[PDB]
DNA sequence: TGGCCCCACGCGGTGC
DNA sequence: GCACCGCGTGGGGCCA
DNA sequence: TGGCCCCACGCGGTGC
DNA sequence: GCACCGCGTGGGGCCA
């Protein structure tokens, strides 16, 4: 399809997203820019065409669904492992036995 | 390669219980799976996960195994009902959201 | 306590 | 410059 | 702050 | 009736 976003940009949106719902909402603005001008064409639309409103382009809405169900959970785990587990593993490997300040306080007290 | 490094469900569950967070959980698995680096000789100091900063690289086989346990205890979010019950309401809300709140107007 | 552990964070290095 | 990556560091809570 | 943003929720309409 | 569906609404968190 033509309205494809880059893998890297999609990952960025996942990271910036506050929740899965907010993640979809961000993709909506990113993929439907014409509705989100200061003209607020967005107000004439919803996802289904309910309440006498126009229906959001189901092609792009199906793409948003794809990112939510196929990419979003994988990128959320990927970002947890890389940003939390890996830093913690490295910290544990390089952690000193005694702090630099605790060593110097002993170095001072022992000679004073 | 790992016959001994293979942890049972009971052993993994115990490590989860003493760990304070997912990150700390990964750190404990590191100690549990790399006992030779965490002796009083502190060979751990020559290593990190990638081999950056002139350090040696942790065995990527066991490091992948640590990942496996981390995602085995803290798995993927099953998005089954999420699209219909969370995303769709948010999409409609964003489409109808007013510029100013009415209480502020 | 005071020692061990966890994690947050300013930092310099890297690399384009 | 700036996005990214591990370091050294110390506040701080738990524990024995 | 105050503007932007997010999301929860009572509500009437719809449709079986 | 009743389960379901988008609406209009306002409490509240983030930020510069």
From Swiss-Prot, chain A:
Residues 1-100 form the BEN domain. The gene is Bend3. Disulfide bonds: none annotated. It is found in: Nucleus; Nucleus, Nucleolus. It comes from Mus musculus. Homooligomer, probably a homooctamer. Interacts with HDAC2 and HDAC3, but not HDAC1. Interacts with SALL4. Interacts with SMARCA5/SNF2H, BAZ2A/TIP5 and USP21. Interacts with the nucleosome remodeling and histone deacetylase (NuRD) repressor complex. Interacts (via BEN domains 1 and 3) with ERCC6L (via N-terminal TPR repeat); the interaction is direct. The BEN domain 4 is necessary and sufficient for the localization of BEND3 to heterochromatic regions. It does not alter association with heterochromatin, but is required for the repression of transcription. The lineage of its organism: Eukaryota, Metazoa, Chordata, Craniata, Vertebrata. The chain holds residues 714 to 825 of 825 of the full protein. Transcriptional repressor which associates with the NoRC (nucleolar remodeling complex) complex and plays a key role in repressing rDNA transcription. The sumoylated form modulates the stability of the NoRC complex component BAZ2A/TIP5 by controlling its USP21-mediated deubiquitination. Binds to unmethylated major satellite DNA and is involved in the recruitment of the Polycomb repressive complex 2 (PRC2) to major satellites. Stimulates the ERCC6L translocase and ATPase activities. This is BEN domain-containing protein 3.
């Amino acid at each position: 399809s033509p309205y494809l976003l880059s893998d890297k940009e999609v990952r960025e949106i996942v990271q910036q997203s506050l929740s899965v719902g907010n993640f979809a909402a961000r993709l909506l603005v990113r993929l439907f820019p014409e509705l989100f001008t200061t003209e607020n064409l967005r107000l004439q639309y919803n996802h289904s065409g309910a309440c006498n409103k126009k229906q959001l382009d189901p092609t792009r809405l199906r793409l948003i669904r794809h990112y939510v169900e196929a990419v979003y959970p994988v990128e959320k785990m990927e970002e947890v492992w890389h940003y939390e587990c890996i830093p913690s593993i490295d910290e544990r490997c390089r952690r000193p036995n005694r702090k630099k300040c605790d060593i110097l306080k002993k170095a001072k007290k022992v000679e004073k």
